[PDB]
Symmetry: C2
Subunit: 343 residues, 2 copies
């Protein structure tokens, strides 16, 4: 078997106090510690997830009744271990996916489905040849329709913005405040609706001290926000998602504990205390959160990432509870391996 | 600060019972969880270590009184996250470093210093265009001088060999026995001397059950050896090294515990029980061991790898003890970060 810390739970079926003996799955055609991007339709009707296969291609898992796997970018397009982040607007007929080339330049994949189209193509961002820090992660927001903002870590470790809109094409945007940890995970959200202008932008990142911090944009410019987590694991995965709950934006910020369990902090008329959503240890690796608002005004959340041993998980927050069934989405060949908890 | 499990020690200056509050270093120009290859001179006079920088270049740290950093392969030569493994012979004037291209093909960097030369160049292996599983690690041995063997994982997850020698150039060698874990770390050693022929080859790897296993070559062919560890962490780093002690090969096999501490098992007239060499938790990431026989007949070992938060460590076994002070080798810009031990 493989050994796992006996104090940690590797799966939903682990013993109550930690792993004793169980079987877990290794999906070896998923890149180990793959990046993840995702977007659930604002209607909740379908889901998109993007990830990197072991062979370096970028793939898509689309849910509509069942999951269907496809390849969106061939090997050679993306850095091995590229970050990923996605946009969806229209409300839901226009998709963009951002990634890094093997030369650490921003790249964009486009999927247009407006009016029944189905056009996939390389975006104009590629031609700007924007070089980023080689360990940069990526975030992005959209507003007013097709006004786009892409966030990355520059070579001097500051967070930086690139902009699209107004007929200008892609142009350098702001340099953000704060002192980001080199290689920090980042996640940016727009609290205002996809068609509204101005946006209300929040970004979450880890600082050089290890704390988690918040970027805030409102008209007038960028500032460091009130969200402060004094300590978090080194290079903790971070992902945030926002949707309106009872007509007020509900921000959900997710990161990992030292036990590699998922911690959530919610902003909704103020920040609520961080709380662990479940006690199952995920692989310490990129996660991706997405959300939508039901007709009753409540907000569903989905989180994707890597579960032990190497499987794509889906965690579901629905009707106000985290569901005990955590799903796995197969992306290729798999082997089952016995796991034993060791002290 | 950053949070770290309070039951684990992040450094040699951590509190006796774990991490409480301390400062640790982040070298952000070292690729996070870089691969490592290494070779100490058989005289012990100098040391070579290779690693991947954040920009994807492959660099070298050479010790002779002090460490000197130099770049050997520019960005674009190597897969981001490439494995690395090295050969040294002549006894100590000819170096080969194996890595993967961004298209998952075996590559070879050559450094020839015989006759006072200083030639660095791409090896003939590159032209064979040997595609490997994208998660493959790499091992290699040399014997009889320039008879080379390179070990990798093929697309069906078997371990495979490529050979060089006999005027035949590079050719496909054996397919090895056993059922290797996809992406297993691998480490191959020659129990016989660099200028002896035939070799006596051992390779250490993790199987689909999670156990650790051993490949054996002796005249007659390949077989699965007697070294078995029934359970080990998933995708545990593995590195082995051999040097003679009292005229018999001393194999040292290193892997990680679930606490990410380094475990050693020695073979020398039989296998000895595995034992933890120190109680400091490394980053669970590639390690690289090397060894030489000291003038008093004892065997020195050096291990390189990633220590918290992201620095290149050197662990030293010398005069029969693992030295308590674990060094770091700077490879670029660094920042200090406070670390606090936290409970569940
Ligand atoms: C909204 C715009 O759509 C296409 O024109 C892309 O080429 C641009 O880069 C941008 O994504
Ligand atoms: C020993 C041999 O040295 C050089 O000729 C290389 O090009 C070969 O690939 C091999 O390493
Ligand atoms: C919404 C704002 O649009 C402006 O053009 C940018 O300069 C700001 O940084 C921000 O993205
Ligand atoms: C919605 C709130 O906006 C403010 O500007 C921030 O300081 C808070 O942390 C939060 O994001
Ligand atoms: C030492 C032996 O040399 C032979 O040529 C190879 O076929 C074997 O696999 C092994 O490497
Ligand atoms: C040196 C010994 O040779 C034998 O063949 C192997 O079975 C042992 O595990 C060990 O390597």
């Amino acid at each position: 078997p493989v050994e796992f810390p006996k104090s940690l739970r590797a799966s939903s079926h682990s013993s109550e106090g930690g792993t004793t003996k169980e079987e877990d799955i290794y999906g070896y055609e998923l890149l180990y510690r793959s990046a993840f991007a995702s977007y659930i339709a604002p209607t909740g009707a379908w889901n998109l997830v993007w990830f990197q296969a072991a062979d370096g291609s970028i793939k898509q898992a689309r849910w509509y009744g069942e999951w269907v796997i496809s390849t969106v970018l061939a090997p050679g397009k993306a850095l091995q271990g590229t970050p990923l982040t996605a946009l969806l607007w229209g409300p839901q007929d226009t998709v963009r996916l951002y990634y890094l080339s093997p030369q650490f330049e921003l790249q964009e994949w486009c999927w247009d489905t407006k009016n029944g189209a189905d056009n996939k193509y390389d975006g104009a961002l590629n031609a700007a040849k924007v070089k980023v820090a080689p360990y940069s992660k990526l975030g992005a927001v959209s507003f007013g329709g097709a006004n786009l903002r892409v966030y990355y870590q520059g070579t001097n470790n500051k967070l930086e913005e690139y902009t699209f809109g107004g007929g200008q094409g892609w142009k350098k945007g702001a340099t953000l405040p704060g002192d980001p940890l080199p290689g920090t995970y980042i996640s940016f959200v727009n609290r205002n609706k996809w068609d509204a202008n101005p946006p209300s932008i929040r970004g979450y990142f880890q600082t050089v001290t290890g704390s988690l911090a918040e970027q805030v944009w409102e008209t007038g410019g960028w500032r460091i926000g009130q969200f402060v987590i004094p300590a978090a694991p080194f290079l903790t995965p971070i992902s945030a998602t926002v949707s309106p709950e009872k007509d007020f934006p509900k921000i959900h910020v997710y990161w990992l504990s030292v036990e590699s369990t998922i911690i959530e902090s919610v902003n909704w008329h103020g920040w609520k205390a961080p709380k662990q959503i479940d006690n199952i240890s995920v692989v310490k690796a990129d996660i991706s959160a997405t959300s939508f608002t039901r007709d009753d005004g409540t907000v569903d959340v989905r989180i994707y990432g890597t579960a032990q041993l190497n499987v794509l998980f889906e965690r579901i927050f629905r009707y106000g509870v985290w569901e005990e069934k955590i799903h796995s989405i197969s992306v290729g060949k798999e082997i089952p391996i016995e796991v034993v908890g060791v002290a």
